[PDB]
Write an enzyme that holds these catalytic residues in place. Structure first.
Site, PDB file in Angstrom:
ATOM      1  N   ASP D  94       0.842  -1.187   0.000  1.00 59.37           N
ATOM      2  CA  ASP D  94       0.000   0.000   0.000  1.00 59.37           C
ATOM      3  C   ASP D  94       0.882   1.245   0.000  1.00 59.37           C
ATOM      4  OD1 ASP D  94      -1.466   2.197   1.688  1.00 59.37           O
ATOM      5  OD2 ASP D  94      -3.149   0.928   1.039  1.00 59.37           O
ATOM      6  N   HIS D  95       1.961   1.203   0.785  1.00 60.02           N
ATOM      7  CA  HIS D  95       2.886   2.306   0.965  1.00 60.02           C
ATOM      8  C   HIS D  95       3.759   2.526  -0.282  1.00 60.02           C
ATOM      9  CE1 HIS D  95       2.336   2.524   5.646  1.00 60.02           C
ATOM     10  NE2 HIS D  95       1.197   2.475   4.978  1.00 60.02           N
ATOM     11  N   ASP D  96       3.729   1.580  -1.240  1.00 61.97           N
ATOM     12  CA  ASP D  96       4.322   1.760  -2.561  1.00 61.97           C
ATOM     13  C   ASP D  96       3.343   2.476  -3.500  1.00 61.97           C
ATOM     14  OD1 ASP D  96       5.850   1.579  -4.987  1.00 61.97           O
ATOM     15  OD2 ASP D  96       6.460  -0.524  -4.561  1.00 61.97           O
TER      16      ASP D  96
HETATM   17  C1  HEM Z   1       0.284  -2.301  10.777  1.00 61.23           C
HETATM   18  C2  HEM Z   1      -0.610  -1.409  11.090  1.00 61.23           C
HETATM   19  C3  HEM Z   1      -1.429  -0.537  10.241  1.00 61.23           C
HETATM   20  C4  HEM Z   1      -1.748   0.687  10.766  1.00 61.23           C
HETATM   21  C5  HEM Z   1      -1.220   1.128  12.102  1.00 61.23           C
HETATM   22  C6  HEM Z   1      -2.463   1.419   9.825  1.00 61.23           C
HETATM   23  C7  HEM Z   1      -2.951   2.708   9.998  1.00 61.23           C
HETATM   24  C8  HEM Z   1      -3.557   3.520   9.046  1.00 61.23           C
HETATM   25  C9  HEM Z   1      -3.962   4.821   9.208  1.00 61.23           C
HETATM   26  C10 HEM Z   1      -3.886   5.635  10.466  1.00 61.23           C
HETATM   27  C11 HEM Z   1      -4.472   5.245   8.017  1.00 61.23           C
HETATM   28  C12 HEM Z   1      -5.076   6.594   7.752  1.00 61.23           C
HETATM   29  C13 HEM Z   1      -6.546   6.660   8.180  1.00 61.23           C
HETATM   30  C14 HEM Z   1      -7.346   7.914   7.807  1.00 61.23           C
HETATM   31  O1  HEM Z   1      -8.123   7.887   6.834  1.00 61.23           O
HETATM   32  O2  HEM Z   1      -7.211   8.925   8.521  1.00 61.23           O
HETATM   33  C15 HEM Z   1      -4.370   4.180   7.130  1.00 61.23           C
HETATM   34  C16 HEM Z   1      -4.702   4.142   5.773  1.00 61.23           C
HETATM   35  C17 HEM Z   1      -4.461   3.126   4.830  1.00 61.23           C
HETATM   36  N1  HEM Z   1      -4.221   1.816   5.124  1.00 61.23           N
HETATM   37 FE1  HEM Z   1      -3.818   1.102   7.019  1.00 61.23          FE
HETATM   38  N2  HEM Z   1      -2.692   0.644   8.736  1.00 61.23           N
HETATM   39  C18 HEM Z   1      -2.044  -0.569   8.992  1.00 61.23           C
HETATM   40  C19 HEM Z   1      -2.095  -1.638   8.106  1.00 61.23           C
HETATM   41  C20 HEM Z   1      -2.595  -1.691   6.807  1.00 61.23           C
HETATM   42  C21 HEM Z   1      -2.690  -2.830   6.011  1.00 61.23           C
HETATM   43  C22 HEM Z   1      -2.334  -4.240   6.402  1.00 61.23           C
HETATM   44  C23 HEM Z   1      -3.176  -2.433   4.764  1.00 61.23           C
HETATM   45  C24 HEM Z   1      -3.427  -3.276   3.583  1.00 61.23           C
HETATM   46  C25 HEM Z   1      -3.162  -4.515   3.355  1.00 61.23           C
HETATM   47  C26 HEM Z   1      -3.363  -1.054   4.847  1.00 61.23           C
HETATM   48  C27 HEM Z   1      -3.830  -0.182   3.839  1.00 61.23           C
HETATM   49  C28 HEM Z   1      -4.058   1.170   3.943  1.00 61.23           C
HETATM   50  C29 HEM Z   1      -4.225   2.056   2.921  1.00 61.23           C
HETATM   51  C30 HEM Z   1      -4.118   1.762   1.448  1.00 61.23           C
HETATM   52  C31 HEM Z   1      -4.475   3.276   3.458  1.00 61.23           C
HETATM   53  C32 HEM Z   1      -4.634   4.568   2.702  1.00 61.23           C
HETATM   54  C33 HEM Z   1      -3.298   5.215   2.352  1.00 61.23           C
HETATM   55  C34 HEM Z   1      -3.417   6.567   1.647  1.00 61.23           C
HETATM   56  O3  HEM Z   1      -3.089   7.579   2.328  1.00 61.23           O
HETATM   57  O4  HEM Z   1      -3.840   6.648   0.455  1.00 61.23           O
HETATM   58  N3  HEM Z   1      -3.021  -0.607   6.118  1.00 61.23           N
HETATM   59  N4  HEM Z   1      -3.812   3.116   7.763  1.00 61.23           N
HETATM   60 CA   LIG Z   2       5.234   3.439  -6.217  1.00 58.62          CA
END
Ligand code: HEM
Ligand SMILES: [Ca+2]
Ligand SMILES: *[C@@H]1O[C@H](CO[C@@H]2O[C@@H](C)[C@@H](O)[C@@H](O)[C@@H]2O)[C@@H](O[C@@H]2O[C@H](CO)[C@@H](O[C@@H]3O[C@H](CO[C@H]4O[C@H](CO)[C@@H](O)[C@H](O)[C@@H]4O)[C@@H](O)[C@H](O)[C@@H]3O)[C@H](O)[C@H]2NC(C)=O)[C@H](O)[C@H]1NC(C)=O
Ligand SMILES: *[C@@H]1O[C@H](CO[C@@H]2O[C@@H](C)[C@@H](O)[C@@H](O)[C@@H]2O)[C@@H](O[C@@H]2O[C@H](CO)[C@@H](O[C@@H]3O[C@H](CO[C@H]4O[C@H](CO)[C@@H](O)[C@H](O)[C@@H]4O)[C@@H](O)[C@H](O)[C@@H]3O)[C@H](O)[C@H]2NC(C)=O)[C@H](O)[C@H]1NC(C)=O
Ligand code: HEM
Ligand SMILES: *[C@@H]1O[C@H](CO)[C@@H](O[C@@H]2O[C@H](CO)[C@@H](O)[C@H](O)[C@H]2NC(C)=O)[C@H](O)[C@H]1NC(C)=O
Ligand SMILES: *[C@@H]1O[C@H](CO)[C@@H](O)[C@H](O)[C@H]1NC(C)=O
Ligand SMILES: *[C@@H]1O[C@H](CO)[C@@H](O)[C@H](O)[C@H]1NC(C)=O
Ligand SMILES: *[C@@H]1O[C@H](CO)[C@@H](O)[C@H](O)[C@H]1NC(C)=O
Ligand SMILES: [Br-]
Ligand SMILES: [Br-]
Ligand SMILES: [Br-]
Ligand SMILES: [Br-]
Ligand SMILES: [Br-]
Ligand SMILES: [Br-]
Ligand SMILES: [Br-]
Ligand SMILES: [Br-]
Ligand SMILES: [Br-]
Ligand SMILES: [Br-]
Ligand SMILES: [Br-]
Ligand SMILES: [Br-]
Ligand SMILES: [Br-]
Ligand SMILES: [Br-]
Ligand SMILES: [Br-]
Ligand SMILES: [Br-]
Ligand SMILES: [Br-]
Ligand SMILES: [Br-]
Ligand SMILES: [Br-]
Ligand SMILES: [Br-]
Ligand SMILES: [Br-]
Ligand SMILES: [Br-]
Ligand SMILES: [Br-]
Ligand SMILES: [Br-]
Ligand SMILES: [Br-]
Ligand SMILES: [Br-]
Ligand SMILES: [Br-]
Ligand SMILES: [Br-]
Ligand SMILES: [Br-]
Ligand SMILES: [Br-]
Ligand SMILES: [Br-]
Ligand SMILES: [Br-]
Ligand SMILES: [Br-]
Ligand SMILES: [Br-]
Ligand SMILES: [Br-]
Ligand SMILES: [Br-]
Ligand SMILES: [Br-]
Ligand SMILES: [Br-]
Ligand SMILES: [Br-]
Ligand SMILES: [Br-]
Ligand SMILES: [Br-]
Ligand SMILES: [Br-]
Ligand SMILES: [Br-]
Ligand SMILES: [Br-]
Ligand SMILES: [Br-]
Ligand SMILES: [Br-]
Ligand SMILES: [Ca+2]
EC number: 1.11.2.2
Lengths: 105, 465, 58, 105, 466, 57
Positions: D94-96
């Site tokens: 996701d972070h990619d």
């Molecule tokens: C390992 C722990 C994980 C978190 C701690 C975490 C936390 C967040 C937070 C705080 C957000 C932002 C929420 C908001 O709308 O204010 C968030 C967004 C996204 N996630 Fe989370 N995440 C953890 C773990 C995962 C896993 C396992 C994911 C997918 C397999 C995953 C996805 C995402 C995505 C795509 C977003 C949005 C990113 C963006 O800014 O576009 N996360 N997460």
């Molecule tokens: Ca990328």
């Protein structure tokens, strides 16, 4: 966006209840394809001298018009099966659908 | 800075440069004026630039009623509760209404015939004065709104002007829909494209996006190839009407005086009915009245409408021919031989390649109009796809579409099916003989013509309260 | 914002000595919706925008 | 965009030669459906007290979480056929792909 | 109004209000803080508001290398021509690199263990410190970059720093792609959806739009259902480590100090390999460590991540469940009974209808995660459609996709097919025993583990230039 | 814009009198790209941004 109405709004707002600007006036065209600009985002092909489009120089629009579109008016072929009212309704119809503003002199 | 009088390329000007050996414009330091279209998000370095539509996308007769609330009020007659559209207070054509006058800063209509001092007309859309044939069509629809409101007023004394105005407007919008989809689009697209892009209507679909696509603003200019170099006027025996029967197009642009002072709309409507359109052919694309002398009476220089079309597509960041072919599910020619086959014309294919280098780069307008026409249509497959796709969205994504359950009653729909453009001409002009069969195909007096009394009126009995 | 020629008809109906009251109130509210609250501010807008409205004045 | 290149740009510019911002950083997301805001163009559902969505009250996000998402954490079901690395690769990936910026306090 | 401390609703703040009888937040005048996502066109009332992606859409390891040129440069070691990524200059992990430290104006890591004074880490993406498990993965890839570069230097001495850096980066990017599409996505989608949405690669298609869709930023948060409430750490016998082997997640957020001072990335990596994911079930969606105590150590109140997701979807103007169903060509339930059939769970359907009134209005994450899971996948049909579609575009619309002709040679492509995440762990850590088969499915020690010696290394011999 | 902890090590390479000239000019170029055109500017930036620089007297 009211939950019961009887006639069109003037601006087109609220025709689509879930996304009420859709088809309303003073809104951006939708894109069916990604835009293609000289710099990716703004400048039209033809802007910067020397900058090619997809490998080839940009043709002057007037140059294309001269070579391809220009014909001797005495050759004009009448359409046996279309009236001039056919042309005119199309322009009238176009004026119901889209007008693209530009800045004023 | 001033794009009208200067050839400097600085925003918002994007002037068209002049090649060597231009047949008209000898001085390469000169240019054809062009303002870039207004951006949706001015000055941004995040958004991809997009352009604005100032009108309602829907086929709602907004060119009559306006697309903005202030304008819409101005168009109405507020001196009574008869629900009418304001009419011209100075002039008539033989007792019948003309459009009211607008009051513009630089009125181009005053610069055609200076002595007549006839300004531009005010209508729902700003382009109503651009050619007197357009004006006539506008004037027709204005009159038909007033006729309807009058008839409804009689049939329903109770009704206030708001009610009369809206009901007439709703009828007028339904007539534009019916003429367009039943009579016009089949002759644009041809039977095959019509069935593929406009299958019989089912019902309203609130997930269909009804916006005009950017590309359509350029694609629908296919109609520039239909334009004839003259304005024809015919008398009440459909004969050349003296002493200017055939006016060159470059002397009719913004010529509002011609409607008011050279015989009203009747002669013009007769000439549209009884003259052929220009046929689009590969070596006869567009006439020099629009290509050399567009708006030449009201500007420092004659414009080139086809060239403006192409510059505009670049202004709007529109992909080229092959990308649109691909969008439509049509094969994409890569070589001159392949482009030849697609165009049934290797000569034209060589001239397109000499300019563009690849069919990838052919401007959408130029590409579209170059294609051979579908059987019994006046566009080729590329434009048929763009045009057909658009009109399907305008139909299926319109909540107030005339056939949509609940807009009109079954009796109202049946009455509305009886309408036709020739009848509207009978109802609102001094013409008694009009085009038969399909008005858009019929083109020859007298074989294609009938007396008005043979045409059934629109019966408003199903609008009775 | 510009005064239109057809609105010159609506000054006649306001000055009409026995025109219906509910008509003449509608026209005042029409013009008051575009910043013109008197008849003297209706002729002063028609003036600036290029017409002749001293065909009422002395 | 240069005509030969051999490596990715950092920003993702020029990956697509005909539309060189596509997939590059600090650009608007593509919309697969038209947006749905309270006012049609900007205000999110739930912004204005009393404004419904398509006929019905907007549920507080925290209420939905309380009533549907919450469960006793000691009753958690381990996934017999996925490792925790499956979770963690998802976050990394996701972070990619996407980060949506917010204004700073 | 400052959104972190005020509950007043004024742009850009869109706080979540608190319901009556909230099990945790008894104070109804409090709120969960929320800043609206930055608009692409600030202050316009022509445009329909849209949000921004700050990263490259492409699967290009931009979470390692950065997505902006100044950041990318800062991540590189510029004191020699070895083409290395910068490493921490104060700490090591049993002789191996840690990420360098970022220098943030308001640094949350420093608030987790005050005495330890360890800041957040610097990486290609700003969230690398959000959990140590994520930090550990960023650290693994950093090391792998430096190893490839070292190895390429040895193979091609005349190459300069820029060449070594780019060629190493190109391999890391290929490795992320391969692990993602060969190993990860099939277990997300299941076989049926894998075939439907990701048919065998043909060739790069320059008409495929590679952008991230707005909806994907919400739908891909399905992963939140996989989160376990503890960080698990295991020693070199895969036994629980030390005094704190199972740390609650609300004490690991931004806890960079745990990587630095409580034993490096090895135990964390062992924990990820030898512990199950949480299963998503219709009655067990997300754990209270993210629902009740998200980031509670570094801010005034514990957040609710599920709730944030639904608030965020509304912020972004996302259509509801039935609209997305329709976009995917899936039936759209109108009644509670129909929703029941779709969910194979009338009980949950009744709960969703009590909240939302109509399935037209169920928020996409909530509706997506509520769906029954596809056979051998971990999403339902709706999320399979959205995620599958997105990744199809990232693959087919990527000119540098590792199997696109001219990107790598045939020999290099064949070498690349041998890579695996288990091997990458062997090569860059003190771990000698690792997951077999597919690392994402293997989860039980010792049953599913093998020695590192049984796995072949990536052979770089076809990267030899004379 | 903030000076980064790992950059302190670049200061060491620049004040090392036995480090390849090429190496140093590369680092000066890296620092000049961030608006720091001399070593005294580099140390000062580190100081403003919170690092102990007192081993550079
Ligand atoms: C390992 C722990 C994980 C978190 C701690 C975490 C936390 C967040 C937070 C705080 C957000 C932002 C929420 C908001 O709308 O204010 C968030 C967004 C996204 N996630 Fe989370 N995440 C953890 C773990 C995962 C896993 C396992 C994911 C997918 C397999 C995953 C996805 C995402 C995505 C795509 C977003 C949005 C990113 C963006 O800014 O576009 N996360 N997460
Ligand atoms: Ca990328
Ligand atoms: C290269 O890739 C493009 C894009 O392909 C899409 O994405 C990839 C990842 C795969 O998922 C594909 O299956 C996707 O289609 C391909 O071009 C597309 O070709 C298709 C089929 O020819 C085109 O679809 C047609 O569209 C016509 C026009 O209407 C469409 O668009 C409007 C937009 O609003 C929409 O309303 C309408 O419903 C349609 O979606 C339509 O008349 C026709 O019946 C058909 O649906 C599609 O438009 C093309 N997309 C483009 C040009 O971006 C290429 O074929 C592919 N090449 C190769 C060799 O693989
Ligand atoms: C109401 O109308 C909508 C929209 O219909 C379109 O326009 C009308 C006028 C007609 O031309 C239709 O044929 C057009 O489709 C209909 O919804 C659409 O239904 C189709 C078929 O189920 C959907 O297409 C699917 O799309 C899936 C997702 O991928 C698509 O989007 C990606 C991203 O842009 C793109 O890459 C891809 O090529 C697809 O275009 C895909 O998995 C699947 O195979 C299939 O292509 C389409 O997405 C729907 N659109 C919307 C807006 O929901 C309704 O079905 C219709 N209802 C009725 C009762 O008529
Ligand atoms: C008498 C007939 C016609 C014209 C005179 C005329 C002129 C124009 C001009 C000047 C433009 C704008 C050029 C530019 O980009 O600067 C223009 C645009 C459009 N046309 Fe033209 N047109 C006449 C006739 C027709 C017919 C018969 C059409 C279709 C059947 C037709 C279409 C259009 C459309 C859709 C546009 C673009 C409108 C917009 O702003 O979105 N016109 N025309
Ligand atoms: C906060 O961090 C400090 C490190 O600075 C932790 O202290 C260490 O604790 C272990 C026991 O697990 C000892 O063996 C070390 O010697 C300690 N070092 C110091 C400097 O005291 C401390 O435990 C952490 N606090 C929490 C709550 O985990
Ligand atoms: C309004 O209608 C009346 C009656 O039909 C007419 O006399 C008058 O001229 C109209 N005014 C305008 C501006 O149309
Ligand atoms: C200009 O308009 C007047 C109308 O009064 C007309 O008599 C005259 O012939 C017009 N001139 C031309 C050249 O048409
Ligand atoms: C650069 O690499 C050298 C050699 O590996 C190493 O000693 C040094 O610490 C590195 N510098 C940074 C900032 O990573
Ligand atoms: Br478009
Ligand atoms: Br775009
Ligand atoms: Br010629
Ligand atoms: Br501009
Ligand atoms: Br009349
Ligand atoms: Br004249
Ligand atoms: Br015009
Ligand atoms: Br009414
Ligand atoms: Br019809
Ligand atoms: Br037909
Ligand atoms: Br649609
Ligand atoms: Br020819
Ligand atoms: Br193309
Ligand atoms: Br072909
Ligand atoms: Br063809
Ligand atoms: Br034929
Ligand atoms: Br025909
Ligand atoms: Br066709
Ligand atoms: Br007649
Ligand atoms: Br007819
Ligand atoms: Br008038
Ligand atoms: Br979206
Ligand atoms: Br939108
Ligand atoms: Br519970
Ligand atoms: Br905001
Ligand atoms: Br509380
Ligand atoms: Br290492
Ligand atoms: Br550091
Ligand atoms: Br702690
Ligand atoms: Br975060
Ligand atoms: Br290089
Ligand atoms: Br793969
Ligand atoms: Br599979
Ligand atoms: Br499937
Ligand atoms: Br696409
Ligand atoms: Br603990
Ligand atoms: Br369950
Ligand atoms: Br349940
Ligand atoms: Br605080
Ligand atoms: Br819906
Ligand atoms: Br259903
Ligand atoms: Br289903
Ligand atoms: Br499985
Ligand atoms: Br081990
Ligand atoms: Br194995
Ligand atoms: Br594996
Ligand atoms: Ca309209």
């Amino acid at each position: 966006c009211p939950e019961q109405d009887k006639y069109r709004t003037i601006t087109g707002m609220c025709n689509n209840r879930r996304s009420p600007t859709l088809g309303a006036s003073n809104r951006a065209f939708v894109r069916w394809l990604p835009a293609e600009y000289e710099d990716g985002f703004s400048l039209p092909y033809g802007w910067t001298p020397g900058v090619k489009r997809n490998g080839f120089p940009v043709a002057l629009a007037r140059a294309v018009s001269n070579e391809i579109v220009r014909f001797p008016t005495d050759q004009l072929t009448p359409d046996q099966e279309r009236s001039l009212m056919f042309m005119q309704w199309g322009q009238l119809l176009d004026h119901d659908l889209d007008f693209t503003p530009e800045p004023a002199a | 800075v001033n794009c009208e009088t200067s050839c400097v390329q600085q925003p918002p000007c994007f002037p068209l440069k002049i090649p060597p050996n231009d047949p008209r414009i000898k001085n390469q330091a000169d240019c054809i004026p062009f303002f870039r279209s207004c951006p949706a998000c001015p000055g941004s370095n995040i958004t991809i630039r997009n352009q604005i539509n100032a009108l309602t996308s829907f086929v709602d007769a907004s060119m009559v009623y306006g697309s903005e609330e202030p304008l819409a009020r101005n168009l109405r007659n507020m001196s009574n509760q008869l629900g009418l559209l304001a009419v011209n207070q100075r002039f008539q054509d033989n007792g019948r209404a003309l459009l009211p006058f607008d009051n513009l800063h630089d009125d181009p209509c005053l610069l055609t015939n200076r002595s007549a001092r006839i300004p531009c007309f005010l209508a729902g859309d700003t382009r109503s004065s651009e050619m007197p044939e357009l004006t006539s069509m506008h004037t027709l629809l204005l009159r038909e709104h007033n006729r309807l409101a009058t008839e409804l007023k009689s049939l329903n004394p109770r009704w206030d002007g708001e009610r009369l105005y809206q009901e007439a407007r709703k009828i007028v919008g339904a007539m534009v829909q019916i003429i367009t989809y039943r009579d016009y689009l089949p002759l644009v697209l041809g039977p095959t494209a019509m069935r593929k892009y406009l299958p019989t209507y089912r019902s309203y679909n609130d997930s269909v996006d009804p916006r005009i696509a950017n590309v359509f603003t350029n694609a629908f200019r296919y109609g520039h190839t239909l334009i004839q170099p003259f304005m024809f006027r015919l008398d009440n025996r459909y004969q050349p009407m003296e002493p200017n029967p055939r006016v060159p197009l470059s002397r009719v642009f913004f010529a509002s005086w011609r409607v008011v002072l050279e015989g009203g709309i009747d002669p013009i409507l007769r000439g549209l009915m009884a003259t052929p359109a220009k046929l689009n052919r590969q070596n006869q694309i567009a006439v020099d009245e629009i290509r050399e002398r567009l708006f030449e009476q009201v500007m420092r220089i004659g414009l080139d409408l086809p060239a403006l079309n192409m510059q505009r597509s670049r202004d709007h960041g529109l992909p080229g021919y092959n990308a649109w072919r691909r969008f439509c599910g049509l094969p994409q020619p890569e070589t001159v031989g392949q482009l030849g086959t697609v165009l049934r014309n290797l000569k034209l294919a060589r001239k397109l390649m000499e300019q563009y280098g690849t069919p990838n780069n052919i401007d959408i307008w130029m590409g579209g109009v170059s294609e051979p026409l579908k059987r019994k249509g006046r566009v080729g497959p590329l434009l048929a796809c763009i045009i057909g796709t658009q009109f399907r969205k305008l139909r299926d994504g319109d909540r107030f579409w005339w056939e949509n359950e609940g807009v009109f009653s079954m009796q109202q729909r049946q009455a509305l099916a009886q309408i036709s453009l020739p009848r509207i001409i009978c109802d609102n002009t001094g013409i008694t003989t009009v085009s038969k069969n399909n008005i858009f195909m019929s083109n020859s007096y007298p074989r294609d013509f009938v007396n008005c009394s043979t045409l059934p009126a629109l019966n408003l009995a199903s609008w009775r309260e | 914002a510009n005064f239109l020629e057809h609105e010159l008809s609506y000054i006649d109906v306001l000055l009409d000595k026995n025109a219906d009251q509910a008509t003449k109130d509608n026209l005042r509210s029409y013009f008051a919706d575009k910043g013109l609250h008197s008849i003297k501010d209706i002729i002063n807008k028609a003036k600036q925008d290029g017409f002749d409205v001293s065909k009422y004045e002395h």
